[PDB]
Amino acid sequence: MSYDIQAWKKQCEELLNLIFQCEDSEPFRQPVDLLEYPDYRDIIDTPMDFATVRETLEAGNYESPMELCKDVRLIFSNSKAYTPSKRSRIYSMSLRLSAFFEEHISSVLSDYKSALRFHK
Numbered sequence: 001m002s003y004d005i006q007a008w009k010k011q012c013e014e015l016l017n018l019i020f021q022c023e024d025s026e027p028f029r030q031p032v033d034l035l036e037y038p039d040y041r042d043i044i045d046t047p048m049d050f051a052t053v054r055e056t057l058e059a060g061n062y063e064s065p066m067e068l069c070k071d072v073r074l075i076f077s078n079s080k081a082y083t084p085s086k087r088s089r090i091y092s093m094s095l096r097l098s099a100f101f102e103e104h105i106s107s108v109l110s111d112y113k114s115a116l117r118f119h120k
């Protein structure tokens with residue numbers, strides 16, 4: 001529905017489903033195993049992954065698509081910080097998937113901002 005301040009929830013659930021089904025999301029689908037990778041927390045202050053984002057959305061624990069978008073962007077900025085080399089296939093996967101995410105989220109954000117303006 002036009003001007004729906006709830007539309008983002010279904011739009012983000014659908015977008016997360018597309019990301020999970022994309023091969024480029026494979027490294028980012030679950031929390032980094034901090035026992036397997038003991039220097040991860042030396043580099044990364046705030047781990048994030050797509051299963052955490054999907055679970056938080058399904059629980060109703062995001063107030064706005066901005067809060068969801070901040071967590072997704074943290075998945076990609078964490079990957080850049082831990083895996084900074086342009087040579088890494090993991091760097092390439094996060095670049096491709098981040099660009100996909102940013103192309104799809106822009107209209108979710110602008111629709112929300114318009115709905116919120118309407119609601120006020």
Ligand SMILES: CN1Cc2ccccc2NC1=O
Pocket residue numbers: 027028032037078079080082083090
């Ligand atoms: C999500 N990760 C975790 C990881 C584990 C092992 C090797 C590289 C990476 N890089 C990432 O960006």
